[PDB]
Symmetry: none
Subunit: 68 residues, 4 copies
């Protein structure tokens, strides 16, 4: 399909370092390192880091960072 | 105590489902499912999901969600 | 910004090979090989090829292939 | 004759602006601005823009626009 990321997390650093924390049965098409948990159905996340964010998949903020 | 979380992600749903996306050589003390990548040094993240956020570790925000 | 591509071209092959043919003052954030013409303003295109398409930038088909 | 184009891209605008996105060790005969990447073998594309499409070279479609 198309490389996209719903929840992109970047550090406040400069240059910032970014990653995609989306979780699912698979990782987005551009993911080099896709790590999954051994459960059914599987749970996978892309562990790659880059200096940029992929475009959203749905353009709908499904998650937010709670200042705990 | 030792179970703490810097970056807590919760869905906007109701009830919301949450998880700790912190990465490191290990996971926090309360983590049931700690998944790591096989690189040196290791990169691990806690795949657990709960309806709440643990307390911050260093009360500092090292990451932010980029509205991509 | 965010790695996106408005016009992704893929061969009919299998596996297909894809590229982004968007042209502008610069290339998208994920471009390794960005080639520009020496005019003012510049005209650049990303010459990278991958087995996937980046997500659209505007989700509005601005170009179409004319069967000449 | 020798100036031919397999993949002609035109905007949906009016009047539409067109270009030939064919890639190769060289550009078609009618190309004014032929831009290449510095790899072996070379990769060149004609950056020219016109309000029309040249005729096909092999009347075959080797590429398609993927609605990403």
């Amino acid at each position: 399909k198309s490389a996209c990321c719903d929840t992109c997390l970047c550090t406040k650093s400069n240059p910032p370092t970014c990653r995609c924390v989306d979780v699912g049965e698979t990782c987005h098409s551009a993911c080099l390192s896709c790590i999954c948990a051994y459960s059914n159905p599987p749970k996978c996340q892309c562990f790659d880091t880059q200096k940029f964010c992929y475009k959203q998949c749905h353009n709908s903020e499904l998650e937010e960072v709670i200042k705990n």
